[PDB]
Design a protein around this ligand. Structure first.
Ligand code: HEM
Length: 392
């Protein structure tokens, strides 16, 4: 019998991961009305992330997912193509080409730090004296929006409105509204490319065009999109997940206040504890695969649980405990294998420089509501909806 996963799972997963982790390293679950297999233990997850039998063909996925519901029916619109023609929806040998090209774009790697520190201080200089504030909508969500945007070259006057469409496509559930919102951005993210094919500047759009092979408009849009959205939501959610733990456990907060030698290691324990992504990109199966010692059939969905793996009592000690002073090296929070977050270095830098600056200016940073008045959203992205901190 396939176990069913409900609204309770979405909000509070890590208990469920722990109940099923002891039973077996992989489980048969029902997430989204879709029977899939869930990889929970650390080694099993590492291995499922290094196996070619797990294919990321969104084309095959959608048709297979519609068949569970019975609805068995094209002109793929711009926005439909934007959502499915990025690295994460592609398998080798075609993934290798794309990842080469996007990495070939530039010493823009350096000077990323100055930008972050600048925009951090700008954001922080605005909330000073404002008493109680929502840290998420004033520091966390504003920062990566400004950081990733200036890398891609999204003009300042256009940055914020792109964040709303990002946020809405995240909150949106129905396919219709998604494809509609996506067609909206896809057009803007085409003039933005077009301006830069005529005005080569010092941004990542200009350099993605300039990279033999080249990246087609199809993949230039798709890549400029994926870097924008995934470097906005998941980055900004890691900050807010991390600060909730840094405010929920106060003893460690003050250790980090005096000793900035802990700043580096804490970021790893933030990613390890509550990561913004506790789940893999779905992947279907071309052939029968053996992961965790359990046979997974062909034409069957497989997701890897990055949360349960990070919380496996074999890999880590008291895996459900926030200790900024742990050998947390080895987390699967940024993925493993051919995929693996290309922009993980930027996520660590943002959080590292963010958390330090918050503690620097504000030594009375504290939560202004009971931990009970805080509520998490119904997304596979572990979010908080609100973080009402009380600076002092
Ligand atoms: C704290 C922030 C982030 C976390 C926790 C995170 C996590 C992940 C994970 C787990 C994957 C692999 C998914 C899978 O294999 O199913 C991934 C992929 C990816 N991420 Fe991130 N990510 C973060 C931020 C970013 C940022 C800021 C960027 C900026 C460009 C980015 C760009 C990418 C790309 C391009 C891939 C595709 C990997 C591939 O297909 O080869 N991510 N991310």
């Amino acid at each position: 019998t396939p176990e069913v996963l409900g609204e309770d799972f979405i909000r509070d997963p890590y208990p469920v991961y722990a109940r099923l982790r002891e039973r077996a390293p992989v489980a048969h679950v029902v997430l989204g009305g879709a029977p899939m297999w869930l990889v929970l233990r650390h080694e099993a997850a590492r291995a499922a992330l290094t196996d070619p039998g797990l294919h990321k063909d969104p084309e095959r996925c959608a048709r297979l997912a519609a068949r569970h519901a019975g609805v068995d029916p094209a002109e793929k619109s711009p926005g439909q193509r934007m959502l499915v023609e990025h690295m994460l929806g592609m398998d080798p040998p075609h993934h290798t080409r794309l990842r080469k090209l996007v990495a070939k774009a530039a010493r823009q790697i350096q000077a990323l730090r100055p930008r972050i520190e600048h925009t951090v201080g700008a954001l922080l200089d605005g909330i000073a004296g404002q008493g109680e504030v929502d840290l998420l909508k004033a520091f966390a969500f504003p920062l990566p929006l400004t950081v990733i945007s200036e890398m891609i070259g999204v003009p300042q006057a256009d940055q914020a409105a792109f964040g709303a469409w990002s946020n809405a496509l995240t909150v949106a559930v129905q396919p219709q509204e998604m494809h509609g919102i996506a067609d909206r951005m896809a057009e803007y993210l085409t003039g933005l490319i077009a301006a830069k094919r005529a005005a080569p500047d010092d941004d990542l759009i200009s350099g993605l065009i300039q990279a033999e092979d080249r990246l087609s408009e199809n993949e230039l849009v798709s890549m400029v999109f994926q870097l924008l959205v995934a470097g906005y939501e998941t980055t900004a959610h890691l900050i807010g997940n991390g600060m909730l733990a840094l405010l929920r456990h106060p003893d460690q907060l003050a250790a980090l206040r005096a000793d900035r030698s802990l700043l580096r290691g804490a970021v790893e324990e933030i990613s390890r504890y509550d990561n913004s992504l506790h789940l893999n990109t779905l992947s279907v199966t071309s052939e029968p695969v053996r992961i965790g010692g359990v046979r997974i059939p062909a034409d069957a969905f497989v997701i890897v649980s990055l949360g349960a793996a990070n919380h496996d009592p074999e890999r880590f000690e008291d895996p459900e405990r926030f200790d900024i002073r742990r050998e947390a090296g080895g987390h699967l929070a940024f993925g493993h294998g051919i995929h693996h977050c290309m922009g993980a270095p930027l996520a660590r830098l943002q959080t590292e420089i963010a958390v330090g600056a918050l503690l620097d200016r504000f030594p009375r940073i504290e939560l202004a509501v009971a931990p009970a008045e805080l509520r998490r959203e119904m997304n596979l992205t572990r979010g908080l909806e609100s973080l009402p901190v009380r600076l002092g």
